Amino acid sequence: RRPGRLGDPDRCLRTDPRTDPRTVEALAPFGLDVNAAPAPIGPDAPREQQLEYAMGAEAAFEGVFAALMDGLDPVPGIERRTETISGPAGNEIKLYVHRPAGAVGPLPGIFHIHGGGMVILQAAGPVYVRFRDELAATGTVVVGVEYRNGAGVLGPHPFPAGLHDCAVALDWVHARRAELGISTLTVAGESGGGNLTLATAIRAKREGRLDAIDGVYALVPYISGMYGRSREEREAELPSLVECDGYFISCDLCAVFVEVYDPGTAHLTDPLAWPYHAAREDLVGLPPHVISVNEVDPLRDEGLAYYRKLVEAGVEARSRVVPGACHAADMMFRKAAPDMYEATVQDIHDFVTSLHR
Numbered sequence: 001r002r003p004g005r006l007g008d009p010d011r012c013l014r015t016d017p018r019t020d021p022r023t024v025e026a027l028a029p030f031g032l033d034v035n036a037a038p039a040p041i042g043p044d045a046p047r048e049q050q051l052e053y054a055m056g057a058e059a060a061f062e063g064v065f066a067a068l069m070d071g072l073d074p075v076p077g078i079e080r081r082t083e084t085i086s087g088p089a090g091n092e093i094k095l096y097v098h099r100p101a102g103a104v105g106p107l108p109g110i111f112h113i114h115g116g117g118m119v120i121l122q123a124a125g126p127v128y129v130r131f132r133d134e135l136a137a138t139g140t141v142v143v144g145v146e147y148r149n150g151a152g153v154l155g156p157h158p159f160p161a162g163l164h165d166c167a168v169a170l171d172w173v174h175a176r177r178a179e180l181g182i183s184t185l186t187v188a189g190e191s192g193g194g195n196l197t198l199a200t201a202i203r204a205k206r207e208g209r210l211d212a213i214d215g216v217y218a219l220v221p222y223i224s225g226m227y228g229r230s231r232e233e234r235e236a237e238l239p240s241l242v243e244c245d246g247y248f249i250s251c252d253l254c255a256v257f258v259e260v261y262d263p264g265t266a267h268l269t270d271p272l273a274w275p276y277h278a279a280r281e282d283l284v285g286l287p288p289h290v291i292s293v294n295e296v297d298p299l300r301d302e303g304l305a306y307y308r309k310l311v312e313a314g315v316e317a318r319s320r321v322v323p324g325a326c327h328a329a330d331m332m333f334r335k336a337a338p339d340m341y342e343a344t345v346q347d348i349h350d351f352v353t354s355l356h357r
């Protein structure tokens, strides 16, 4: 009958007949081809224990991402620099700059915001280094921002610390397009980085900084903040949150990460924390957007809802789905599913080359 865990509650990535089997075998060594056990902590646990759990999850997932990137030949012909800038709280923000060696003029720029639920993972990590090199290789200038995290080794900094860091870093890059070899400038990211990407555009309109943004490309955005709702509430509003729950990511662990990001959840309905809540007023006048969602991702339906909201607001919006893809499959499986990876890289390349100032 119904797809995924709507039809059979025990279905997992391996047993869903829609999953790209290459990705199932790629996740098998880590035990990530099946549903994780119910998370042993919840959103009402003491914050000290939530931050401990997040620190562990970060160390484990950084291990998995390193192993998924191991065995690849490096992307050839990329020049890299690290710049350090002052953040708004006296923090240092690192910028990782990638460009094709020997470019003869300006190229489209990509301001890249990494995922990890705005709480964990480093832009310095091999999965994001690889993604920035791959985008640079197509003929772009990529700047990866290392913002404050809600948790883990770059934490703990609640909302809106990371968002403010992204703002300051975007302004720093915009101010320097000529010396950085940048034509147009696109803000892009996946999952939590998709969240900060969409919020960065909403915030830039409010603050009169839209000149910094020619385009927005959000992949598998993590934007509803609704992971802690009941199975029935989730199914009523965003059925993918039940259909594909536990497929690589789990609503129970995300619900912890929501509390970690915004302790006391005073921002649960604030579109700068959870862009799914954007009003028409928040989206009118925003520059061109792409929303890329993944077929067997529990976040699929909140990404589709955001595309619909952008269209309703008159934004020059596009959307695509990656068939057979779990959450972020198109950025994790460079080894096991290179065609899926290449297709997303090329779609982003095509988008940024389409823009004019």
Ligand SMILES: Cc1cc(=O)oc2cc(O)ccc12
Residues within 6 Å of the ligand: 061, 115, 116, 117, 118, 119, 120, 192, 248, 249, 250, 251, 253, 254, 257
């Ligand atoms: C790797 C990872 C990053 C995140 O922000 O959230 C998650 C949630 C999960 O259930 C499983 C993995 C992650």
